[PDB]
Ligand SMILES: CC1(C)CC(=O)N(CC(=O)N2CCC(N3N=C(c4ccc(OC(F)F)c(OC(F)F)c4)[C@H]4CC=CC[C@H]4C3=O)CC2)C(=O)C1
Ligand SMILES: [Mg+2]
């Protein structure tokens with residue numbers, strides 16, 4: 001990895017974020033990005049401020065400069081795609097911060113685990129190209145062939161972990177360099193476990209395991225911690241429907257356009273195009289959001305909150321308010 005420069009750091013360090021509270025559940029990243037002509041720097045500054053404000057990097061021997069270096073090394077490996085770009089990972093990082101600290105999920109985890117989760121947010125989609133795992137498998141792309149030959153169908157997630165390990169292999173961007181022995185092993189394993197658990201093909205199994213652990217007062221403690229981390233990163237990843245409506249809608253627009261660009265490529269290659277990826281199906285945003293809410297997000301958030309994460313009740317509340325608002329879009333159309 002090429003070293004991050006003084007000038008790259010300074011460009012983040014000059015951003016002051018006047019009028020934003022990066023800790024708040026109603027924080028608006030889109031408004032942040034509209035606030036200046038250097039939205040990549042502002043986004044990096046948001047992530048930097050979240051991580052320093054937690055007080056965690058300092059505790060684990062991670063200097064301000066190495067933190068910032070890490071952030072910028074992550075930033076350089078996001079692509080200019082509509083949804084899976086740097087702003088998504090910063091959003092996930094900020095969202096996780098709220099679940100840990102406004103939702104009191106920090107109480108279930110060690111400080112190191114909280115630190116790992118915040119850092120893992122920033123790595124969890126590295127070098128996404130706006131195409132899902134299915135695209136690579138269907139088209140027998142080289143990465144798809146490799147995944148199948150090597151026995152792991154989570155095509156992208158293994159790729160993201162690869163790039164995360166590369167970033168962390170240089171002390172100048174290794175936020176875990178202050179760790180050794182068991183703690184360092186836990187930091188890397190937990191980060192990788194969490195990234196691997198973001199594959200939506202494993203959603204139901206991940207959720208069911210967590211719920212069975214939370215219900216068992218004799219669950220293995222280390223396993224419960226790890227599953228809680230996995231579920232929190234998953235929660236962040238499907239959290240767009242938990243945000244104020246207008247934020248939620250802007251995310252939905254970005255994901256829809258990404259999906260449509262995939263579908264356009266699949267059409268060119270003569271492979272199967274799912275309806276949600278087909279521009280010509282012209283699917284209404286409201287109906288798709290209601291469907292994602294009903295079949296994925298509402299039961300996920302309700303189940304985890306009820307099982308164990310009572311402080312995150314607001315997520316269920318906001319999903320219910322967003323669903324009602326989409327229903328009003330349909331009612332008035
Ligand atoms: C069609 C149905 C009636 C039945 C059904 O099975 N599903 C689920 C479904 O079709 N899935 C599962 C999730 C997948 N998925 N979808 C993402 C995503 C993000 C934000 C979204 O909008 C808003 F929140 F911004 C969004 O909503 C829109 F798609 F509806 C989807 C990502 C989540 C995690 C990782 C990468 C992205 C990923 O793997 C896509 C396939 C239904 O949607 C209803
Ligand atoms: Mg992902």
Ligand SMILES: [Zn+2]
Nearest residue numbers: 088124125237
């Ligand atoms: Zn993601």
